[PDB]
Design a protein around this ligand. Structure first.
Ligand SMILES: [Cl-]
Length: 165
C-alpha cells in the first residue's frame, strides 16, 4: 500500500466484462486504472455531475470535469462553463468518453492532466501539491496491479486505495 493508506481488492460482479468493453473502446491500462479508482462498476451511476455544476461538474466513467472537457475536446470547443450539461453526452457514450480522455491528456500532458483532473483550474495553476501527488500515486499503484497480472485486465477484481490516507 502507498503511504499510511489502507488498500486492497474485492470482487465486483460483471466488472470483468466491463473492463473488456472499456479496453475495446480504446482504454489503456492507465485509463482502466483511472476508471477503477473513480467508480466501482466503471459506470456513470454516481450523482449527476457528481453533485457539482459548471466547470466542476464531472461526467463519464473517468469523472472528467467540464473545464478539462471544454478546454481540450473538439466536441465541446468554444463552450462556456455554464454549458456544462452538454458534458452529459459522455454518460451515454463510452467511445466519446475515451476519445475525450485521450484528447484531454494529449492537450495538457499527463502530469498537468492529473492536476486538472483532481483540482480543476486551481490544479492546473498549482499542479505540484501533495494532494495531487497522492492521487497520482493511487492511480499508478492500481496500474501496477493491472500490469503485474494481465488476468486483472479482464477479471472481476477491483483494486482500491484510500486516497485521503
Ligand atoms: Cl478531467
Amino acid at each position: 500500500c502507498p503511504s499510511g493508506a489502507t488498500c486492497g481488492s474485492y470482487t465486483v460482479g460483471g466488472l470483468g466484462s466491463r473492463k473488456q468493453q472499456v479496453r475495446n473502446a480504446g482504454g489503456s491500462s492507465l485509463d482502466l486504472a483511472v476508471a477503477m479508482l473513480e467508480t466501482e462498476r466503471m459506470d456513470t451511476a454516481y450523482p449527476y455531475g457528481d453533485n457539482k455544476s459548471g466547470d466542476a461538474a464531472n461526467f463519464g466513467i473517468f469523472k472528467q470535469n467540464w473545464l478539462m472537457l471544454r478546454s481540450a475536446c473538439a466536441q465541446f470547443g468554444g463552450q462556456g462553463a455554464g454549458q456544462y450539461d452538454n458534458g452529459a453526452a459522455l454518460n451515454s457514450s463510452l467511445g466519446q468518453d475515451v476519445s475525450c480522455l485521450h484528447q484531454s491528456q494529449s492537450h495538457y500532458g499527463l502530469d498537468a492532466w492529473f492536476a486538472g483532473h483532481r483540482n480543476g483550474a486551481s490544479g492546473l495553476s498549482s499542479p505540484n501539491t501533495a494532494d495531487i501527488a497522492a492521487y497520482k500515486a493511487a492511480v499508478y499503484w492500481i496500474k501496477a496491479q493491472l500490469d503485474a497480472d494481465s488476468a486483472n485486465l479482464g477479471n472481476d477484481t477491483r483494486f482500491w486505495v484510500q486516497v485521503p490516507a
